[PDB]
Amino acid sequence: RRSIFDAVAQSNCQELESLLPFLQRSETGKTCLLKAMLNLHNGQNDTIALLLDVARKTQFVNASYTDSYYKGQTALHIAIERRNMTLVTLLVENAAANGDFFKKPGFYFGELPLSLAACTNQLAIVKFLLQNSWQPADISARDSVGNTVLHALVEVADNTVDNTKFVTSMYNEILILGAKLHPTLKLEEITNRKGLTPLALAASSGKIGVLAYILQREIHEPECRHLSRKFTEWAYGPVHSSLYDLSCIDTCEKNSVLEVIAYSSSETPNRHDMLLVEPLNRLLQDKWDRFVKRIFYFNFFVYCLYMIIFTAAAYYRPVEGLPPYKLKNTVGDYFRVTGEILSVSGGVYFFFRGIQYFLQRRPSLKSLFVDSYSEILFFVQSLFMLVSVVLYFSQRKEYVASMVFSLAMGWTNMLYYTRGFQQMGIYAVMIEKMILRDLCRFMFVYLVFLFGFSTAVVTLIEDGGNSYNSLYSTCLELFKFTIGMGDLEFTENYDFKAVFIILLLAYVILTYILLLNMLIALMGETVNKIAQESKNIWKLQRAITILDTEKSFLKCMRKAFRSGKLLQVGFTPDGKDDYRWCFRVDEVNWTTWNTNVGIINEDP
Amino acid sequence: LVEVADNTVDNTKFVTSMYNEILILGAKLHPTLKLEEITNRKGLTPLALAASSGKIGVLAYILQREIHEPECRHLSRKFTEWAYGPVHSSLYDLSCIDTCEKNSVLEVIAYSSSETPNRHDMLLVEPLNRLLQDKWDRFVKRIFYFNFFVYCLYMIIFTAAAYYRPVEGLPPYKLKNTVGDYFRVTGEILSVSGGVYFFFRGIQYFLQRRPSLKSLFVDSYSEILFFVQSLFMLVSVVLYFSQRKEYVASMVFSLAMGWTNMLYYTRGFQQMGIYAVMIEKMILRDLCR
Amino acid sequence: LLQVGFTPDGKDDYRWCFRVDEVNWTTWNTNVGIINEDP
Numbered sequence: 001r002r003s004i005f006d007a008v009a010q011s012n013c014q015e016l017e018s019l020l021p022f023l024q025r026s027e028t029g030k031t032c033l034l035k036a037m038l039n040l041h042n043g044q045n046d047t048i049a050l051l052l053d054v055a056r057k058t059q060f061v062n063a064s065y066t067d068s069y070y071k072g073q074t075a076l077h078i079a080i081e082r083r084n085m086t087l088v089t090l091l092v093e094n095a096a097a098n099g100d101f102f103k104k105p106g107f108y109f110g111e112l113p114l115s116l117a118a119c120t121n122q123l124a125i126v127k128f129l130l131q132n133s134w135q136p137a138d139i140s141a142r143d144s145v146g147n148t149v150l151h152a153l154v155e156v157a158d159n160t161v162d163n164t165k166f167v168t169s170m171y172n173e174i175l176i177l178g179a180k181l182h183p184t185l186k187l188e189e190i191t192n193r194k195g196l197t198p199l200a201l202a203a204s205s206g207k208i209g210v211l212a213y214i215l216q217r218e219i220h221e222p223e224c225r226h227l228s229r230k231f232t233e234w235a236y237g238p239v240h241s242s243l244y245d246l247s248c249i250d251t252c253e254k255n256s257v258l259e260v261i262a263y264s265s266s267e268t269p270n271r272h273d274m275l276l277v278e279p280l281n282r283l284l285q286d287k288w289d290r291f292v293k294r295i296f297y298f299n300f301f302v303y304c305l306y307m308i309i310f311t312a313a314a315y316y317r318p319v320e321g322l323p324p325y326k327l328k329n330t331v332g333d334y335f336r337v338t339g340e341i342l343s344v345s346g347g348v349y350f351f352f353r354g355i356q357y358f359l360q361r362r363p364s365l366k367s368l369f370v371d372s373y374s375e376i377l378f379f380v381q382s383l384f385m386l387v388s389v390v391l392y393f394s395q396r397k398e399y400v401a402s403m404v405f406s407l408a409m410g411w412t413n414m415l416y417y418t419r420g421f422q423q424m425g426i427y428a429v430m431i432e433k434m435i436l437r438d439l440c441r442f443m444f445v446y447l448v449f450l451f452g453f454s455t456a457v458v459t460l461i462e463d464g465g466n467s468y469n470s471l472y473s474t475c476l477e478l479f480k481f482t483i484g485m486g487d488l489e490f491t492e493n494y495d496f497k498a499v500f501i502i503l504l505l506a507y508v509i510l511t512y513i514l515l516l517n518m519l520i521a522l523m524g525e526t527v528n529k530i531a532q533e534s535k536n537i538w539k540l541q542r543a544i545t546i547l548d549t550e551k552s553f554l555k556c557m558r559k560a561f562r563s564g565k566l567l568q569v570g571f572t573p574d575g576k577d578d579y580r581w582c583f584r585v586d587e588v589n590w591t592t593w594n595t596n597v598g599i600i601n602e603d604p
Numbered sequence: 605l606v607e608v609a610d611n612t613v614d615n616t617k618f619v620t621s622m623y624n625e626i627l628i629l630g631a632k633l634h635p636t637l638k639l640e641e642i643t644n645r646k647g648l649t650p651l652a653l654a655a656s657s658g659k660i661g662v663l664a665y666i667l668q669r670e671i672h673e674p675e676c677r678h679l680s681r682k683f684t685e686w687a688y689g690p691v692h693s694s695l696y697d698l699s700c701i702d703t704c705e706k707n708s709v710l711e712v713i714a715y716s717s718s719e720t721p722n723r724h725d726m727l728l729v730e731p732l733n734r735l736l737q738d739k740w741d742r743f744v745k746r747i748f749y750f751n752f753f754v755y756c757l758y759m760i761i762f763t764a765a766a767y768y769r770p771v772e773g774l775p776p777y778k779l780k781n782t783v784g785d786y787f788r789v790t791g792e793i794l795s796v797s798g799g800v801y802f803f804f805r806g807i808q809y810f811l812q813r814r815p816s817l818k819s820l821f822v823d824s825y826s827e828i829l830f831f832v833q834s835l836f837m838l839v840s841v842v843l844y845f846s847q848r849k850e851y852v853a854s855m856v857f858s859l860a861m862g863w864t865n866m867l868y869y870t871r872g873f874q875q876m877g878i879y880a881v882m883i884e885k886m887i888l889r890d891l892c893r
Numbered sequence: 894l895l896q897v898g899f900t901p902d903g904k905d906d907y908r909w910c911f912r913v914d915e916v917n918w919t920t921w922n923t924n925v926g927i928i929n930e931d932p
């Protein structure tokens with residue numbers, strides 16, 4: 001064994017030739033062929049052919065490494081990786097890499113020779129394997145996870161421009177070849193174990209390039225034209241109207257692309273930019289303009305009424321006695337009690353809606369305050385209302401201490417409804433983001449400074465006065481300096497006036513002049529950085545609003561409000577009458593001058 | 605060759621190319637001799653000299669250089685452990701980047717007196733940033749957080765003991781059998797011990813580094829502030845045991861400084877470390893004018 | 894501590910290395926000198 005391995009590594013067949021007659025007369029698992037293939041330089045491994053001939057003259061071709069790390073690897077995989085067309089053909093003429101190296105430091109390409117060839121830019125080897133006379137590869141085969149070659153191609157994509165160009169081109173080539181070989185089979189419809197298709201997988205994983213390619217792709221070849229999603233309804237001059245498939249973009253049995261993009265947990269790289277693709281933005285705008293805007297405005301109006309009733313009923317709360325408060329025959333009492341009942345009902349409604357959302361989505365802690373700010377705020381207001389009810393019926397007077405907070409939250413939650421308008425939706429987005437990010441840092445630093453100087457000042461004071469020798473009072477008096485209401489001499493119970501005035505001046509210069517102006521500068525810089533990002537965040541928020549409204553209204557009319565019209569785009573390869581729910585859009589282009597064919601309809 | 609380099613793009617290309625050529629020829633003629641190991645009178649090697657003088661181009665060339673020629677391959681620092689497809693894992697030498705007998709590159713870059721042109725950008729080279737992040741994640745983060753926690757405890761004890769200072773009489777204040785007096789005296793002892801500790805640490809730093817006056821407030825802001833707080837504490841002690849009531853006039857200042865020194869510990873976090881950096885720089889530059 | 898090759902006179906060039914991975918689509922595998930046979 002050692003001598004054979006040494007001869008194979010040395011690329012010398014003299015020792016192997018001498019030992020062959022002797023053999024005839026007489027943890028890893030690597031075979032002689034695998035070792036020869038691995039230890040090959042510039043195709044200098046010549047012992048492979050002799051070893052294969054000897055093995056045939058004496059099952060060895062399929063020998064594979066048995067190690068869990070490299071389980072399943074064979075000579076064909078090594079040849080394919082090495083980019084040896086001749087060696088690959090020779091090995092094929094005369095499996096799945098399940099090893100941990102090839103599972104989801106490692107490289108994932110699927111677990112089939114066809115997938116490995118497809119993911120590596122060896123198109124010729126893909127073609128040869130697909131139409132190899134000795135043995136053709138199975139285009140529809142799936143690995144352990146269930147990914148096909150198309151799933152593997154989607155997984156490989158990393159949004160790099162060259163990588164995107166590759167993955168899209170190879171996807172198109174494999175699609176066309178698969179259609180040519182097996183017209184009946186629908187390759188894209190296949191799903192992996194998780195249940196996602198290549199399009200759904202691309203939308204879920206954030207691969208914007210693959211999604212953009214798939215959504216709007218046209219194959220002009222008459223041989224394979226049904227493998228397209230964007231057609232051309234007609235064209236007269238520089239004007240032409242086209243269609244988009246919208247097959248599983250609007251409503252799909254498993255999961256549509258819109259809801260996969262919108263309901264992503266923000267771990268997806270670029271959810272915000274994934275809705276700018278050609279069909280999706282226009283589809284969302286169509287849904288907004290058609291039937292969602294009126295429902296949104298009605299919801300806003302009803303919330304306004306609820307808040308007005310809540311404010312009126314809380315303003316006129318009974319003040320004399322202890323809760324609960326017995327009813328009175330006066331009409332005012334009846335109206336007040338009606339207001340309280342309506343407020344409590346609204347609180348319960350929001351409580352249940354928040355619980356429903358948190359169960360359905362199961363957000364993680366990190367993304368809880370980054371993707372569900374509005375839901376958290378509404379749920380917290382409902383929680384305050386319910387605590388207020390519990391205290392009120394427990395003969396406690398602290399219920400008001402809860403109620404007011406809820407009431408305050410109520411009004412400040414009206415900003416949620418500013419997402420129906422672009423220019424105010426962006427303003428609310430910036431308010432949210434600044435509150436989340438900047439104020440935490442600013443307040444940590446501010447409180448460090450304030451507490452340090454308040455402790456120093458109250459230590460200096462001796463109260464011997466107005467009992468200013470209190471930490472709370474000194475903290476409040478030093479905080480007043482920040483809001484332009486600070487008295488420089490608010491006490492005289494100190495033995496040393498110079499120390500007191502020096503401390504106050506230092507605090508004023510360090511916080512009022514330095515920290516606050518620095519915060520102004522940082523807010524200005526942040527406004528510039530996120531001028532465009534806020535627009536994308538607002539668009540995502542409105543898209544989620546549209547999806548929620550449509551899902552809620554599905555009960556009233558599940559399929560009545562469907563986007564796009566059913567149209568015939570051509571004939572199927574086997575039958576005819578290729579009917580699909582298309583979404584027409586027009587376009588005008590002076591430069592190119594009408595040079596194309598395939599206009600579905602004769603007359604514009 | 606290192607001395608000649610002036611960080612110009614053409615100059616850098618020259619100096620690196622000639623360095624490589626001379627290295628290869630020297631290896632061919634005299635394989636046994638290790639040319640780079642030689643040092644000048646000051647004791648620096650070409651790599652250490654490049655790191656010290658701020659020559660970022662020469663440092664970047666030296667740190668990550670591979671000579672594929674089989675004749676002279678050991679004259680390389682960045683290898684290639686393996687490669688399967690578009691994925692490959694490589695290695696870096698780290699010979700005298702982490703620990704060196706004379707002076708490692710990391711400590712030469714970090715402990716430079718800011719006269720070096722571009723200390724700040726010299727840590728972005730391929731091995732150094734990842735090496736520092738590895739050290740942070742592995743064993744330094746926990747010690748930093750423990751130090752922050754202990755400083756928080758010290759500051760809380762100091763604040764509590766200074767808040768309840770005796771007000772009637774003249775120092776020193778005789779002890780009382782009450783438990784509150786025992787706790788207060790324990791707080792004072794702990795505060796004084798912390799002040800002495802920071803005093804000695806500041807003296808140690810200033811002796812080891814010997815900063816110049818110009819760079820004193822540009823490279824050792826935190827050290828100066830901690831030393832000044834310790835100085836205030838010691839002056840407070842001296843006045844307190846001299847039967848003077850002005851010790852409080854010192855103590856409070858120290859106390860104030862104490863809390864505002866917590867910002868030193870915001871460098872364990874990027875987004876607040878940058879904020880503290882800007883506070884420092886603005887205080888130094890803009891407010892004077 | 895890892896072995897990176899053989900010294901010009903002796904052998905077993907051992908040094909304290911710091912491994913890092915890299916991924917690159919564009920260039921397509923064209924080099925030699927991989928220290929280890931198997932990834």
Ligand SMILES: C=C(C)[C@]12C[C@@H](C)[C@@]34O[C@](Cc5ccccc5)(O[C@@H]1[C@@H]3C=C(COC(=O)Cc1ccc(O)c(OC)c1)C[C@]1(O)C(=O)C(C)=C[C@@H]41)O2
Pocket residue numbers: 373374375376377378380405408409410412413414415416428429431432435439
């Ligand atoms: C859950 C969180 C973060 C939060 C809950 C409450 C207590 C809140 O204080 C904060 C912390 C705070 C405290 C003081 C000033 C700023 C922030 O911020 C919000 C939270 C911050 C707001 C600011 O107003 C808004 O953000 C409205 C709003 C903006 C964007 C939205 O998409 C939105 O949809 C619901 C609502 C107002 C309060 O909710 C309010 O009215 C009360 C009494 C305190 C504010 O805690």
Ligand SMILES: C=C(C)[C@]12C[C@@H](C)[C@@]34O[C@](Cc5ccccc5)(O[C@@H]1[C@@H]3C=C(COC(=O)Cc1ccc(O)c(OC)c1)C[C@]1(O)C(=O)C(C)=C[C@@H]41)O2
Pocket residue numbers: 506509510825826827828829830832857860861862864865866867868880881883884887891
């Ligand atoms: C050595 C110097 C420059 C200094 C020492 C003290 C007296 C200081 O005033 C200054 C001058 C001054 C006075 C008033 C306003 C701004 C600046 O600035 C600092 C110095 C300025 C600060 C500002 O807070 C900080 O800078 C905290 C800090 C930031 C960055 C750090 O890396 C850091 O590490 C220790 C600490 C607070 C004081 O130290 C403080 O608490 C007291 C009572 C006065 C401030 O002199």
